[PDB]
Amino acid sequence: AFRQALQLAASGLAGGSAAVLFSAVAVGKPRAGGD
Numbered sequence: 001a002f003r004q005a006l007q008l009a010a011s012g013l014a015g016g017s018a019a020v021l022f023s024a025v026a027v028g029k030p031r032a033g034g035d
Helices: 002-013 018-026
Strands: none
């Protein structure tokens, strides 16, 4: 049972802030041609 064990581990840790890190990549674009 890997499908049942995968959903179980998702509740144990329960992510949240990791979602912010994702968007932090799009808005986190250094000045490649400005300063």
